mmCIF file of C-alpha atoms and ligand atoms in Angstrom:
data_model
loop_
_atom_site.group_PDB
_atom_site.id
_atom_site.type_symbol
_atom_site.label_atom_id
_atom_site.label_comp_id
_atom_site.label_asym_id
_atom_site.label_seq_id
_atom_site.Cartn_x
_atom_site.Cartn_y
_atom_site.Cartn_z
ATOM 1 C CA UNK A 1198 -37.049 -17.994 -20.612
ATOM 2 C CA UNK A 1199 -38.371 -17.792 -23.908
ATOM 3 C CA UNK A 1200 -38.406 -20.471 -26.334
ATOM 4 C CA UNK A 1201 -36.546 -22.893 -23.933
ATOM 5 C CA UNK A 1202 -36.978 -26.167 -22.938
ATOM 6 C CA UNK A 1203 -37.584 -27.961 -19.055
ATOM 7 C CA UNK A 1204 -34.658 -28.601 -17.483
ATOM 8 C CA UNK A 1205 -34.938 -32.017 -15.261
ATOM 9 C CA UNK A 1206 -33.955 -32.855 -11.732
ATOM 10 C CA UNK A 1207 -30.551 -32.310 -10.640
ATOM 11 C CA UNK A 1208 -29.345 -30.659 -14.146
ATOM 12 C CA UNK A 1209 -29.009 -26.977 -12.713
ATOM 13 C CA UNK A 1210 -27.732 -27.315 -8.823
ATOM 14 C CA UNK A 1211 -26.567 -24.076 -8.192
ATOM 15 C CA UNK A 1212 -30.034 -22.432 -9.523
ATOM 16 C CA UNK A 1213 -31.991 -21.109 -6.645
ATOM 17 C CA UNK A 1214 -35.529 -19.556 -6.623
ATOM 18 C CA UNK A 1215 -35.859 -16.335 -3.976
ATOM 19 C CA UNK A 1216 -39.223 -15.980 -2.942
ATOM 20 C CA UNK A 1217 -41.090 -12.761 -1.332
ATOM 21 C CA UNK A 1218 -43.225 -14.172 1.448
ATOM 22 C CA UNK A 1219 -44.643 -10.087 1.348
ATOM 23 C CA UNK A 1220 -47.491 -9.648 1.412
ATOM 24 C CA UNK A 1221 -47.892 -12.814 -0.048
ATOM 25 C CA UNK A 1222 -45.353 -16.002 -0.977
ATOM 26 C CA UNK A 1223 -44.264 -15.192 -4.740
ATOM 27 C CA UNK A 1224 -41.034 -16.244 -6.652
ATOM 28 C CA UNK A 1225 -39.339 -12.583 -7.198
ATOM 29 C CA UNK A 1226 -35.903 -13.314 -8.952
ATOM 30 C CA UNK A 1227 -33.113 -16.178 -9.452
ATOM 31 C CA UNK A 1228 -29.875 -16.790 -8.137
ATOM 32 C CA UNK A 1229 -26.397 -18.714 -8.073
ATOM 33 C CA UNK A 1230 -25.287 -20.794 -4.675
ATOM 34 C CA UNK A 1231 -21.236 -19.496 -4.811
ATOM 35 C CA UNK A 1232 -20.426 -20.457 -1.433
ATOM 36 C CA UNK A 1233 -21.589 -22.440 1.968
ATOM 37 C CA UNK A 1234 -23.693 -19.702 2.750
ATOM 38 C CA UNK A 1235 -23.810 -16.948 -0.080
ATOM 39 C CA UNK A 1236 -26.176 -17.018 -3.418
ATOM 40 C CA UNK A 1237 -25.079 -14.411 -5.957
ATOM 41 C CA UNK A 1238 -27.904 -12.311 -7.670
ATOM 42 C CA UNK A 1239 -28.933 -9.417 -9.375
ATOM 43 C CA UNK A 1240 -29.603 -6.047 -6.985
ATOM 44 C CA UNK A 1241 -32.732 -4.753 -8.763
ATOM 45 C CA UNK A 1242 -34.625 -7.737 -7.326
ATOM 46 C CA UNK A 1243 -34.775 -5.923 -3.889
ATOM 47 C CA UNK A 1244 -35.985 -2.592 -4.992
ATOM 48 C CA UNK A 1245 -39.471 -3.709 -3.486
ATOM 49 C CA UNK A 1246 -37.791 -5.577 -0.481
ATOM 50 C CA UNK A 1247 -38.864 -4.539 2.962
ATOM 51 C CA UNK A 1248 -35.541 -6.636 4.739
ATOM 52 C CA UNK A 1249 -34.446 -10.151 4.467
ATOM 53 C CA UNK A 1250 -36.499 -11.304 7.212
ATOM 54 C CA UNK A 1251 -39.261 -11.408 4.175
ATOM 55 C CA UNK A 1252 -36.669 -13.931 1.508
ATOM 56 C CA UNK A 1253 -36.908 -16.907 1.370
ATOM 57 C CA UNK A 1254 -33.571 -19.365 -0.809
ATOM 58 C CA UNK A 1255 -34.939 -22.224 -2.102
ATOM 59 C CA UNK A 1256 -32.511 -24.620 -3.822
ATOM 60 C CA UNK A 1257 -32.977 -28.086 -5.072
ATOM 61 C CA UNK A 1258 -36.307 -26.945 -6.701
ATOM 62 C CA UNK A 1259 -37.390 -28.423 -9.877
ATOM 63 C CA UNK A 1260 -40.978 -26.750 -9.908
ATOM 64 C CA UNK A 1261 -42.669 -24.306 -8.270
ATOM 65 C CA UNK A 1262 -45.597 -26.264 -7.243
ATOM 66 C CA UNK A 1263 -42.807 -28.017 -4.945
ATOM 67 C CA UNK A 1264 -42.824 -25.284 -3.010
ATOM 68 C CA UNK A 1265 -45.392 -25.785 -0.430
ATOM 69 C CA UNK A 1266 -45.397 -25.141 3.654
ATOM 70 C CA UNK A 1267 -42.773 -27.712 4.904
ATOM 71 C CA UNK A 1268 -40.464 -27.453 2.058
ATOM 72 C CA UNK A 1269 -37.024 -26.846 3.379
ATOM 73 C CA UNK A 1270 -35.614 -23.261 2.671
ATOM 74 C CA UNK A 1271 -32.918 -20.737 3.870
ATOM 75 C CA UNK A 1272 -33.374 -17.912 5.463
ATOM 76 C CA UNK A 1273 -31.715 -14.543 4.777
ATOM 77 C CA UNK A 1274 -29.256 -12.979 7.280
ATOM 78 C CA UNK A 1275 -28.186 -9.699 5.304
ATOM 79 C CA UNK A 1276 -28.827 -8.327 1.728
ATOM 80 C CA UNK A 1277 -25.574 -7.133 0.431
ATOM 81 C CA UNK A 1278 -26.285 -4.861 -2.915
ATOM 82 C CA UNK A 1279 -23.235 -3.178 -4.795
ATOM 83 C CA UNK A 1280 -22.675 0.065 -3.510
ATOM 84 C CA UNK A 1281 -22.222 1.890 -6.910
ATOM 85 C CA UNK A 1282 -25.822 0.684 -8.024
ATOM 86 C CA UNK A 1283 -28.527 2.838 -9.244
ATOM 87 C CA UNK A 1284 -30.599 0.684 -11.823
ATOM 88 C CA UNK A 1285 -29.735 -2.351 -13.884
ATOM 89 C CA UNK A 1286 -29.025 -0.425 -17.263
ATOM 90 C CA UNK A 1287 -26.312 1.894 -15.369
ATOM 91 C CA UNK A 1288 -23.980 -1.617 -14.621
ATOM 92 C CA UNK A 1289 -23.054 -2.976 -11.266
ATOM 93 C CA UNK A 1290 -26.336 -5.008 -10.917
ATOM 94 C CA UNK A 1291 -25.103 -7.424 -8.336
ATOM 95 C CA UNK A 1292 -25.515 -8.331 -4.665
ATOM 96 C CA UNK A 1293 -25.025 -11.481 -2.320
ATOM 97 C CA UNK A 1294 -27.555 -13.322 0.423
ATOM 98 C CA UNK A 1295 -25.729 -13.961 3.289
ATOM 99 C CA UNK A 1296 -28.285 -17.036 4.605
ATOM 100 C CA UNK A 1297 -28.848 -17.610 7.628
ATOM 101 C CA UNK A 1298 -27.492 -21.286 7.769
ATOM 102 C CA UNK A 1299 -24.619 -23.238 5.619
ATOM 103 C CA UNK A 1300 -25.791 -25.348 2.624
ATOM 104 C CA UNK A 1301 -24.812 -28.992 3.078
ATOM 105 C CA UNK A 1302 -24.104 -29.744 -0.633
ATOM 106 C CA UNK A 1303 -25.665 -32.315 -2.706
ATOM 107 C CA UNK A 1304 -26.751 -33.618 -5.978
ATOM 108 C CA UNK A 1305 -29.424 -31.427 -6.017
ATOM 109 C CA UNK A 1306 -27.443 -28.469 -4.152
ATOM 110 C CA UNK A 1307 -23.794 -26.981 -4.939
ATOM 111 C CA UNK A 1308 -21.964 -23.991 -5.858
ATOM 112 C CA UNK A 1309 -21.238 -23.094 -9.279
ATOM 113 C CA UNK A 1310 -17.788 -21.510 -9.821
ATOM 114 C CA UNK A 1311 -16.799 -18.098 -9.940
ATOM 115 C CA UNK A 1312 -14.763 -17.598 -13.499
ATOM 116 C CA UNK A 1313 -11.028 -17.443 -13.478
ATOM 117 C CA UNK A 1314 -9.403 -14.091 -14.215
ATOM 118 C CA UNK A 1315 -7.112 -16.052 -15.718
ATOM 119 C CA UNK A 1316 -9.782 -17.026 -18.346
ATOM 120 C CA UNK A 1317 -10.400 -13.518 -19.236
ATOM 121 C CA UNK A 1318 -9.302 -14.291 -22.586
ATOM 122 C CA UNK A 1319 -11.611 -17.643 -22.915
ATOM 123 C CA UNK A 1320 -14.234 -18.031 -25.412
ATOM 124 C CA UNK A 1321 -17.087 -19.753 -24.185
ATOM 125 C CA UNK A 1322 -19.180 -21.070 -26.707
ATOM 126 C CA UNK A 1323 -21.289 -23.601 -23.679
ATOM 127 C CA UNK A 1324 -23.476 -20.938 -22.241
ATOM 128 C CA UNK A 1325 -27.135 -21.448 -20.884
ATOM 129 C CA UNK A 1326 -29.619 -19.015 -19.087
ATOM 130 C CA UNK A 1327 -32.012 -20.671 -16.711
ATOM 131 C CA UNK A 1328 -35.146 -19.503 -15.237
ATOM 132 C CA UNK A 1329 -38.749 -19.725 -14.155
ATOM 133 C CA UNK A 1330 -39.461 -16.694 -16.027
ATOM 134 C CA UNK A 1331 -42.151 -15.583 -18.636
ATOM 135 C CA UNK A 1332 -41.887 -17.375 -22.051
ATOM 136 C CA UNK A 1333 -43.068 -14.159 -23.607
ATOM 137 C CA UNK A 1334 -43.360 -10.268 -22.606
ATOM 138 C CA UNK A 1335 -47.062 -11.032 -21.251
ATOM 139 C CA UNK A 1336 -46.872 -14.353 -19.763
ATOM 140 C CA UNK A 1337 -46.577 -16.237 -16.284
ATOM 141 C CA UNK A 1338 -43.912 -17.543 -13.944
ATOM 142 C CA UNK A 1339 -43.534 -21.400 -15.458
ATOM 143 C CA UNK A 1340 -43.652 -24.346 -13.180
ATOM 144 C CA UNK A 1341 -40.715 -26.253 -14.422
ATOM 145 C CA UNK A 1342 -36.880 -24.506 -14.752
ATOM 146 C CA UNK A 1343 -36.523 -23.936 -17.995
ATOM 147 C CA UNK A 1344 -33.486 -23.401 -20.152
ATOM 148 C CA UNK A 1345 -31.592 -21.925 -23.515
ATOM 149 C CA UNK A 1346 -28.128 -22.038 -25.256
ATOM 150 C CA UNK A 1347 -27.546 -18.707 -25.882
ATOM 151 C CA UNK A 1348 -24.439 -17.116 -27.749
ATOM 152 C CA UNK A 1349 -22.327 -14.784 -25.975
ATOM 153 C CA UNK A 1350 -22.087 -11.438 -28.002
ATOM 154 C CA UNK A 1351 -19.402 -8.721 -27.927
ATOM 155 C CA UNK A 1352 -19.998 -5.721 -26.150
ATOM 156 C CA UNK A 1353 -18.711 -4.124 -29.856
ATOM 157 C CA UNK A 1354 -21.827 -5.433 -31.444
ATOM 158 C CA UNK A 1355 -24.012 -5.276 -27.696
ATOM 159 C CA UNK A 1356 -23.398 -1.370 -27.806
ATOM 160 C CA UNK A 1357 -24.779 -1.066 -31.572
ATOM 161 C CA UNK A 1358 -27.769 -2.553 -30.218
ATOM 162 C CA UNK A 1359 -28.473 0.010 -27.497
ATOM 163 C CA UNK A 1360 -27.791 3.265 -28.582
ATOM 164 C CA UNK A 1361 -29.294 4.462 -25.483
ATOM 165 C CA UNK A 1362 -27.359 3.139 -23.231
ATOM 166 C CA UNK A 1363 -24.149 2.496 -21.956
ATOM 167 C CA UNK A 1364 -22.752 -1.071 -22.658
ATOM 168 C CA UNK A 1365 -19.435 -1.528 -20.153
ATOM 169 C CA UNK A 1366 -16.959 -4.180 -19.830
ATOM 170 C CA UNK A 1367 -18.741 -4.919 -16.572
ATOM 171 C CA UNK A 1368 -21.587 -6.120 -19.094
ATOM 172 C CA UNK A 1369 -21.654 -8.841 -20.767
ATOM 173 C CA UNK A 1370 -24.326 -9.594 -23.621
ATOM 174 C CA UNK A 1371 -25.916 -13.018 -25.152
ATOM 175 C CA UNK A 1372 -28.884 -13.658 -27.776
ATOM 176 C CA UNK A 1373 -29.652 -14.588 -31.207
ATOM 177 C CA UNK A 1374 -29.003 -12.169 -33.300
ATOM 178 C CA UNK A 1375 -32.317 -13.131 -35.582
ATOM 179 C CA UNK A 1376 -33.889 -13.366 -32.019
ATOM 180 C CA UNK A 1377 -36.067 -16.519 -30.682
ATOM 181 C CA UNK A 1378 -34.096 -17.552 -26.889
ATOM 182 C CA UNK A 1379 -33.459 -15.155 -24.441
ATOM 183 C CA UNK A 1380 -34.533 -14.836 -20.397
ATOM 184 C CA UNK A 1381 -37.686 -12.652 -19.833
ATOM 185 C CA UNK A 1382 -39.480 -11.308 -16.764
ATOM 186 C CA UNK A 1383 -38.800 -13.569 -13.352
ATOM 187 C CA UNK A 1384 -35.557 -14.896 -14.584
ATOM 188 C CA UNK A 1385 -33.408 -11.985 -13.952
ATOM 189 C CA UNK A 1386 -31.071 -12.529 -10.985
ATOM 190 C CA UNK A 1387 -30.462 -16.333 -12.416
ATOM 191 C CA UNK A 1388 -27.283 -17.797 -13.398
ATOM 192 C CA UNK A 1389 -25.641 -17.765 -17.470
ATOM 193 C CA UNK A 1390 -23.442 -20.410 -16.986
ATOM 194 C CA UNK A 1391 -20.915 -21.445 -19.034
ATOM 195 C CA UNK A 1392 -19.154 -25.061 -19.505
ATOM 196 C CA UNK A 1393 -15.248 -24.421 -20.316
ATOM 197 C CA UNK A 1394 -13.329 -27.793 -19.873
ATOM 198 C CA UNK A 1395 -16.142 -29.687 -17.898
ATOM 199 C CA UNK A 1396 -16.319 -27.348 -15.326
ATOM 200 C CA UNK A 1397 -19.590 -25.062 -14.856
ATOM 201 C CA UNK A 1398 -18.551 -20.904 -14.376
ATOM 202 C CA UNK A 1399 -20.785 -18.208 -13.258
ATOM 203 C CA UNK A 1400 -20.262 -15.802 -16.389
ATOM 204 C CA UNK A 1401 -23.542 -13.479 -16.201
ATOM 205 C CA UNK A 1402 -26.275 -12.675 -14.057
ATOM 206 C CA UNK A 1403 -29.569 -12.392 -15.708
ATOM 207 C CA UNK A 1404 -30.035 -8.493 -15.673
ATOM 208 C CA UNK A 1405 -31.843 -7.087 -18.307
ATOM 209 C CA UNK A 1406 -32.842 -6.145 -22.175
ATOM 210 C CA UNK A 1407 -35.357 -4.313 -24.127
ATOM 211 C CA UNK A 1408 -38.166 -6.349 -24.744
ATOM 212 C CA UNK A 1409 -37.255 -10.623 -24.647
ATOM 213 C CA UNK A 1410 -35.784 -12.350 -27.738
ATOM 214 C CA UNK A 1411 -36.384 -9.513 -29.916
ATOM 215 C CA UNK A 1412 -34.471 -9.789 -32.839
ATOM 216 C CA UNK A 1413 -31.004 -7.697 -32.546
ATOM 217 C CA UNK A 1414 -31.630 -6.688 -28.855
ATOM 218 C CA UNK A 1415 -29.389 -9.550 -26.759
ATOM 219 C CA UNK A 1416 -30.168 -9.752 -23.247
ATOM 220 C CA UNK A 1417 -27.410 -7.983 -20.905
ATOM 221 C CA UNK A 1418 -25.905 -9.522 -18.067
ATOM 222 C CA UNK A 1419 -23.756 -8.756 -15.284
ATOM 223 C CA UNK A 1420 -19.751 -9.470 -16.026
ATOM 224 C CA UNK A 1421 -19.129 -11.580 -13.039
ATOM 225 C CA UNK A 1422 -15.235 -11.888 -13.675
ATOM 226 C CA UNK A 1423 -15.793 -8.199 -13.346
ATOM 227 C CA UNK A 1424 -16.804 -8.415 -10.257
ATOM 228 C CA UNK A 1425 -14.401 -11.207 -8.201
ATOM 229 C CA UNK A 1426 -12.743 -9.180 -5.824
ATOM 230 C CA UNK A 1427 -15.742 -7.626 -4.783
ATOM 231 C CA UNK A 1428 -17.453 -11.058 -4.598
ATOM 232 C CA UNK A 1429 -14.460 -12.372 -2.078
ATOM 233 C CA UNK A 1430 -14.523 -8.936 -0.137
ATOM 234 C CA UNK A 1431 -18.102 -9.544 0.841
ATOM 235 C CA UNK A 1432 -17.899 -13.391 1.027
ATOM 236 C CA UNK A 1433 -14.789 -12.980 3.418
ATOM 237 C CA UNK A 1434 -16.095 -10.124 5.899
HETATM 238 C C1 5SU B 2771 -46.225 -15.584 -8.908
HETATM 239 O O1 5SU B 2771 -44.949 -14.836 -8.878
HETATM 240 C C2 5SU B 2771 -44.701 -14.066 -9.944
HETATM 241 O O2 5SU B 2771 -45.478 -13.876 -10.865
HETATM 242 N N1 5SU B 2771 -43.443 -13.560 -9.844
HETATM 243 C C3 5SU B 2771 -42.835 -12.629 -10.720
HETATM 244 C C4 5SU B 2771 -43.422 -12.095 -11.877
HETATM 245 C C5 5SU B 2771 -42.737 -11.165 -12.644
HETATM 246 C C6 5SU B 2771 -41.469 -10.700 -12.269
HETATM 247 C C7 5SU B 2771 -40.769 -9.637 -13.044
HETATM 248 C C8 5SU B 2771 -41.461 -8.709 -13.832
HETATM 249 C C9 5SU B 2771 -40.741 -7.777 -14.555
HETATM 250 N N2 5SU B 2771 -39.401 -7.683 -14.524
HETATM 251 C C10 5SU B 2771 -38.745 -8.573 -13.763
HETATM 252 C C11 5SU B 2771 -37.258 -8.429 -13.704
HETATM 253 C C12 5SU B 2771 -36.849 -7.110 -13.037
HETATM 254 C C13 5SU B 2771 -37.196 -6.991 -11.564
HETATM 255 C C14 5SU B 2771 -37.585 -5.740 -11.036
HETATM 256 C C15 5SU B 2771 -37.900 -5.602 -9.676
HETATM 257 C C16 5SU B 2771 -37.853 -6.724 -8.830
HETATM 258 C C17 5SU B 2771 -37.487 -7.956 -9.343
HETATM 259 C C18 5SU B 2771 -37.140 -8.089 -10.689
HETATM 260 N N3 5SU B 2771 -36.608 -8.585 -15.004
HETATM 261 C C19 5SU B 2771 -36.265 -9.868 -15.420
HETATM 262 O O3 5SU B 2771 -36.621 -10.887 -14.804
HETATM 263 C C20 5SU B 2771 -35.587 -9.997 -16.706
HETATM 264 C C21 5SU B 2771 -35.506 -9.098 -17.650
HETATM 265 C C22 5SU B 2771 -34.801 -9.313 -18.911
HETATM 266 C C23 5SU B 2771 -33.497 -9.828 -18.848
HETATM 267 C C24 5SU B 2771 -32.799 -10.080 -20.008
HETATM 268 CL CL1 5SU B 2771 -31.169 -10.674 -19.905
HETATM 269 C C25 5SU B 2771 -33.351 -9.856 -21.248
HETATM 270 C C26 5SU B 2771 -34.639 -9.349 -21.334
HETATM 271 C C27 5SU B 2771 -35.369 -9.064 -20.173
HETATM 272 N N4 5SU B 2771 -36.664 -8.457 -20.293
HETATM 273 C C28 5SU B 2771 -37.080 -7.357 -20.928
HETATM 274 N N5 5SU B 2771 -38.359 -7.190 -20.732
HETATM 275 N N6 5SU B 2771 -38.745 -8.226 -19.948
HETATM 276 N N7 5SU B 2771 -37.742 -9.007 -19.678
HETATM 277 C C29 5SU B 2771 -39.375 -9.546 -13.038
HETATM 278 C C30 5SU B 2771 -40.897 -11.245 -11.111
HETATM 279 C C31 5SU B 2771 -41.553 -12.207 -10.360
HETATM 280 C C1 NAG B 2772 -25.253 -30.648 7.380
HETATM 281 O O1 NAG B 2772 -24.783 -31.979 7.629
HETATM 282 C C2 NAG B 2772 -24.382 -32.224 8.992
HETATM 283 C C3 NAG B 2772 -23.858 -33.643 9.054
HETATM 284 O O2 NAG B 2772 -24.777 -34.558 8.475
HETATM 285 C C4 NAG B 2772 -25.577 -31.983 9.911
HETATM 286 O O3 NAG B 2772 -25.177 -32.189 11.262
HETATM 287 C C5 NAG B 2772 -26.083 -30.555 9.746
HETATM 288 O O4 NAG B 2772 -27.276 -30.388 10.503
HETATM 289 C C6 NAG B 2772 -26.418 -30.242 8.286
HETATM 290 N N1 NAG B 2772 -26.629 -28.810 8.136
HETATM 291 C C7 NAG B 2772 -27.479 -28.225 7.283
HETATM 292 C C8 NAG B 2772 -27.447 -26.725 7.274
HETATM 293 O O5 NAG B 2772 -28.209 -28.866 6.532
#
């Protein structure tokens, strides 16, 4: 995340950390608990992943240096990866963990809520990207979870930005337009959550952007309201 600030204990429940453990234990992407045993994510975070016998979920995780040999952690049971994906800038960047075990929620562990397509028409003006990601192109994972407000953009003005690309309503965008806050390498797959009438939703999923906080190049996330039916198709199967 660049230019954000540490997030403390507790503040971001549904924030989860997804580890490699090959060849060696590394954090590789974020993600969103949505369910007793499902974390939402982005799918270009497995394009280097062997099978899920090699993830490891960890939720409840303030820092990294937390993470040590006996800290608890779920297991993966199946990798579930959109089946129109290609690559993050041609849309449907999205997949679900299927862990191995239910999550007991607590305090420090719960789902965030899917948005209502109901509130397809709802402003949200509350939203924050989270992450352990770089605080600049060349950087390093940070230690604590850090977070941004960011404003949502419209995919009118997202699409200006990135000529090359195709912006679809199964994006959504967010950044400053005179740059500064925006997620950067190791946060994609992470939740941009929105408060709407003191509930938490799951609007984005931290996909990707050309170069972080760059002035007039918002980050681009995954629509998740886009994406509900699929979400309770795989959930329910
Ligand atoms: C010790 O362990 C480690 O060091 N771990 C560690 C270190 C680096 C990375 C990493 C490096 C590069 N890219 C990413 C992924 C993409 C990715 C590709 C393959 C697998 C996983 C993830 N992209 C983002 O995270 C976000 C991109 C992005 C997203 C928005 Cl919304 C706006 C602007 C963005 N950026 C543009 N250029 N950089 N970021 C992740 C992952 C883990
Ligand atoms: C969840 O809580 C129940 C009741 O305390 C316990 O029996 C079970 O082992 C816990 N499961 C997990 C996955 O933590």
């Amino acid at each position: 995340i660049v230019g954000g600030t540490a997030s403390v204990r507790g503040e971001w429940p549904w924030q989860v950390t997804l580890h490699t453990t090959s060849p060696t234990q590394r954090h590789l992407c974020g993600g969103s608990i949505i369910g007793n045993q499902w974390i939402l994510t982005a799918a270009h975070c497995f394009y280097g992943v062997e099978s899920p016998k090699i993830l490891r979920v960890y939720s409840g995780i303030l820092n990294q240096s937390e993470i040590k040999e006996d800290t608890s952690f779920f297991g993966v049971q199946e990798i579930i990866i959109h089946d129109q994906y290609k690559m993050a800038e041609s849309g449907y960047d999205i997949a679900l963990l299927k862990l191995e075990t239910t999550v007991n929620y607590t305090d420090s562990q719960r789902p965030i809520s899917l948005p209502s397509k109901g509130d397809r028409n709802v402003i949200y003006t509350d939203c924050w990207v989270t992450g352990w990601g770089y605080r600049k192109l060349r950087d390093k994972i940070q230690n604590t979870l850090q977070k941004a407000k960011i404003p949502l953009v419209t995919n009118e003005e997202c699409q200006k930005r990135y000529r090359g690309h195709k912006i679809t309503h199964k994006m959504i965008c967010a950044g400053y337009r005179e740059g500064g806050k925006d997620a950067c390498k190791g946060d994609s797959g992470g939740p941009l959550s929105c408060k709407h009438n003191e509930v938490w939703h799951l609007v984005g999923i931290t996909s990707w952007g050309e170069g972080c906080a760059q002035r007039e190049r918002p980050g681009v996330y995954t629509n998740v309201v886009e994406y509900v039916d699929w979400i309770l198709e795989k959930t329910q199967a």
